[PDB]
Write a protein that binds this DNA or RNA. Structure first.
Ligand SMILES: [Mg+2]
Ligand SMILES: [Mg+2]
Lengths: 157, 158
DNA sequence: TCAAAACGTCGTAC
DNA sequence: TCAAAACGTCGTAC
DNA sequence: GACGTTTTGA
DNA sequence: GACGTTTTGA
């Protein structure tokens, strides 16, 4: 199978250098619990070399390619079912981001049960940990927010 | 064997994303012909995770790591005899930057003979071609500079 | 005279 | 009600 | 890179 | 990233 391991290792190298394994709390008004924990693997490259994200998509067999209005393209794999399959491909080779993976994999464990406020609360605390491994300072929605809101919908978390 | 090839594939993966396979013309005033063509593979990372550049050095067996003053670290392999050896490791796996690799290997071919003013000239012209690919155009110093100043040192190039 | 080691920093690809 | 597909953009790690 | 935002559609 | 520059030293 090792042709495939060469490609996964290569991709792991690329992700480690230029990717994004993430978990975010996004506001969703039509959700009962008001919040979703979005999980994603993302890879950036300038649109000039758009073709490589298409190659990554082929290697993985999952995920969407888009162009950005600023001259960048993104390859993206959202959602637990598809993203678990992918992370377990890259997990033996990831180095710099093995930690954001495992956490995200622990999050995906709970996504099926996330209608339950305590389970949602758990995924939200986990997202924050992933938030502390990303350079990003943009993180505005936290677990503190999900809990106050959950509190206020009259749920016991 | 197959383990080393997995590390070289990962590293190829890394260089394609945050590497720099380059060829610069640097002015060296103590040089007879005033110019040197520098070949280099460089990998960048935040000093936050300075450790990854030491992992890359160990895997390769060559290169220097430094801390920059602004919070980044670079791992760098300079020069023909050691940078050649690194390229042939990565070459089968470099996707994005294999052109820069192949050009730089054509340049390393002639560095031993770069005391010949026409040989330095074929080398400088290959430096600019690498440049049309490493697309951050902060370079002022081109082959036309070398050729013309070579002309004024009394040397016959074209 | 060569040329790597080590360096400082501005622009944009993330 | 869920949640991915698709999106726009500033800050900083390259 | 890492966010938040708007759209599609199950 | 991808330059140009100073330093060490063979
Ligand atoms: Mg990076
Ligand atoms: Mg890159």
């Amino acid at each position: 199978n090792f042709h495939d391991q060469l490609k996964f290792a290569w991709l792991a190298g690329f992700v480690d250098a230029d990717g994004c394994i993430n978990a975010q709390i996004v506001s969703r008004e039509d959700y009962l619990l008001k919040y979703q924990v979005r999980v994603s693997l993302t890879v950036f490259q300038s649109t000039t070399q758009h073709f490589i994200l298409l190659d990554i998509q082929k290697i993985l067999g999952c995920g969407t390619v888009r162009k950005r209005n600023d001259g960048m393209s993104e390859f993206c794999v959202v959602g637990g079912t598809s993203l678990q399959t992918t992370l377990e491909k890259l997990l033996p080779y990831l180095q710099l981001k093995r930690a954001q993976a495992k956490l995200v994999l622990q999050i995906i464990k709970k996504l099926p049960n996330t209608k339950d406020p305590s389970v949602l609360m758990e995924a939200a605390l986990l997202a924050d940990k992933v938030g502390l491994l990303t350079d990003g300072k943009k993180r505005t929605i936290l677990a503190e927010n999900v809990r106050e809101c959950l509190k206020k919908l009259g749920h016991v978390v």
